Structure formats: C-alpha cells, structure tokens
Amino acid sequence: NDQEKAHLDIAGSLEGHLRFLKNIILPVYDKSLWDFLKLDVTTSIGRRQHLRVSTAFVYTKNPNGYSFSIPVKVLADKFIIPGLKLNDLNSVLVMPTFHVPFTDLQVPSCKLDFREIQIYKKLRTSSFALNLPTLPEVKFPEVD
Amino acid sequence: ANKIADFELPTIIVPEQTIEIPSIKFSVPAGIVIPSFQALTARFEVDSPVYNATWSASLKNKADYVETVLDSTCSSTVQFLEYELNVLGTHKIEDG
C-alpha cells in the first residue's frame, strides 16, 4: 500500500508423496485410474504430487489524480492564503508583545487578518526560568 | 543529624542535568487528492497436473471509454475439459 498502486498477492504451494494412491483400479469400469484418465505422468505410478494456487490483485492510481488543495502563498517567512472576503468584522488585529510576570517569556507581536489568513513560518521563544534559591532551576533555552 | 546521633550526614552535590525535549512535529491536512481510476487487474490461477485453470479480469479506463477484458481458460486430463472463453467490452461515455 503506497501512493502509486495497491497490491495484494497470495500464493500457496502444496507438496506430497501421493504415490500409493495413484495406483488404483476402477472395478466398475474394469479399468484403472490412469487408464480412464488417459494420463501417465504423476497418475500411472504416482510421483511427488504438487498443487499450486495464486491470487493477484493490482490497482493503479494516480498520485495527483483530482487534487483540490487550498491556495497558499509563501513570500519570505509567512504563508498567506486568500480566505473568504466577508466584510463584516474588523480589518486586521495587531497583538503587540506581552511580558508574562514571574517569568521571562517574550512573546513577539502578531498580525491576524480576517479577509485572508496570514501565518508566520517561524516563531521564536526566548529563554526563561524561575528564581528558586538552593534548588534545581529548570531553564528553558530559546526555541524556533 | 549531629544533634540526634553525633554523626553528620555526608554532603551530596547533584550537579547540572540536561533533559532532552524531542523535535516534535504536527502535520495537518491541506487538501484532498483523490486518485483517478486507471487499471484494475484480478488474476486467479490454479495448477495441478489433472487441472490447470486461469481466470483474468481486467478493467481499464482510457480517455472516455472503459474497457473490460475477461479470460477464462482451463485444461485437464480429459479431451472435453479444456476450454477458452474470452470477452472484450468497450463502453464509451459521451455526455451521457
């Protein structure tokens, strides 16, 4: 199962030594097995006997086919998507930086759009810790 | 400890530790990608030296027509058990 095709294949092999049973005679026909079958190999004497079964299922699909995807614009460091232009709410909201007390978290500003969708490719979080004397202070370094 | 048993505890100094936070990734859908039907093949085969049979069904979709090919062959030790059936059907759709 991949993005190209679907493949289901099952095989079975049966081997035996059904030799003593190929040597049977039909008294009602007054003729033997292989005589009535008119087959000698594997049938007259009975050699190593085999049975093979094979099942193959293949479906072909296109990796693109019908691809309906949302249009996304990538300029430098932000993805801009032309969402539905419904002029009902405000135009754009700017959330400046905010400092969380009792820690050192630095959240950068954001610009959220109503008509379109703007997302920032990279988000940067500064390092911050606590103030615990004679205790193991867990300092979290910056993450992008 | 010295107050209770005149024996002070050994001093333990447990240093810095570095805890790993794995690089986590969340993948969210963007759009639908529904593949187009091109070909479907189903083959069944049985082999025995008294009976060898093979059926093959092939359903193809080319341009605006679906083709369907059916093969059914069989062989045996009796001179009236070995047959071949073939079927070819083309169905072209033009605006209904």
Side-chain angles (χ1 to χ4, degrees):
Chain A
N1 184 22
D2 57 0
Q3 322 306 318
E4 181 68 25
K5 292 181 185 62
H7 279 250
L8 276 297
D9 305 327
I10 297 91
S13 175
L14 178 145
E15 180 272 328
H17 290 68
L18 315 180
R19 53 181 178 179
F20 45 89
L21 60 84
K22 305 307 293 288
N23 317 307
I24 193 56
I25 297 175
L26 290 78
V28 293
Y29 292 165
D30 208 4
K31 71 180 59 46
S32 62
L33 172 60
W34 54 95
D35 182 3
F36 182 76
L37 298 185
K38 300 175 295 300
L39 179 52
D40 305 331
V41 296
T42 72
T43 303
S44 54
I45 190 187
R47 53 174 288 172
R48 176 176 50 181
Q49 309 284 339
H50 295 285
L51 175 58
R52 291 309 101 70
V53 286
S54 299
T55 62
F57 181 77
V58 177
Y59 167 72
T60 76
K61 58 182 178 180
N62 295 12
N64 297 91
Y66 301 150
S67 181
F68 177 83
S69 59
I70 297 179
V72 183
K73 302 296 296 181
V74 182
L75 283 73
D77 296 321
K78 63 182 63 178
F79 306 159
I80 297 179
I81 297 89
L84 297 182
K85 311 294 186 288
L86 299 180
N87 182 21
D88 304 331
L89 297 177
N90 305 330
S91 57
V92 57
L93 185 57
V94 181
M95 195 47 248
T97 178
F98 185 83
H99 177 63
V100 184
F102 301 153
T103 182
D104 301 328
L105 177 58
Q106 297 293 338
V107 182
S109 61
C110 179
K111 269 72 60 183
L112 66 92
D113 192 8
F114 299 91
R115 308 302 182 271
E116 293 179 351
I117 297 174
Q118 172 191 179
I119 193 60
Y120 302 87
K121 178 181 180 180
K122 301 179 181 180
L123 299 179
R124 298 88 181 178
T125 297
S126 60
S127 61
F128 53 91
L130 304 180
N131 304 120
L132 300 180
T134 70
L135 293 177
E137 298 185 2
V138 185
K139 300 182 299 180
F140 171 76
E142 311 180 2
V143 62
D144 292 357
Chain B
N2 185 270
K3 165 185 174 300
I4 62 178
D6 300 1
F7 180 85
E8 301 180 0
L9 300 178
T11 286
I12 301 298
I13 301 301
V14 187
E16 181 65 26
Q17 294 287 338
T18 303
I19 301 302
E20 64 182 1
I21 301 301
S23 59
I24 191 173
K25 177 183 58 180
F26 292 92
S27 301
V28 291
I32 62 174
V33 182
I34 301 302
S36 59
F37 183 92
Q38 314 294 151
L40 186 56
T41 62
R43 190 278 310 151
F44 277 173
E45 189 272 343
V46 59
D47 191 10
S48 58
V50 64
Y51 271 119
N52 183 269
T54 297
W55 295 354
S56 179
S58 59
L59 199 152
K60 309 297 165 284
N61 183 24
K62 272 74 178 172
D64 296 322
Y65 41 90
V66 174
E67 311 86 329
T68 310
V69 180
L70 276 296
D71 181 7
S72 172
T73 181
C74 179
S75 301
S76 177
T77 179
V78 184
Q79 287 65 6
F80 291 90
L81 298 187
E82 295 179 353
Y83 70 89
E84 158 64 15
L85 182 62
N86 60 5
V87 173
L88 168 59
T90 302
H91 295 88
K92 193 178 179 302
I93 297 181
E94 53 275 13
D95 301 330

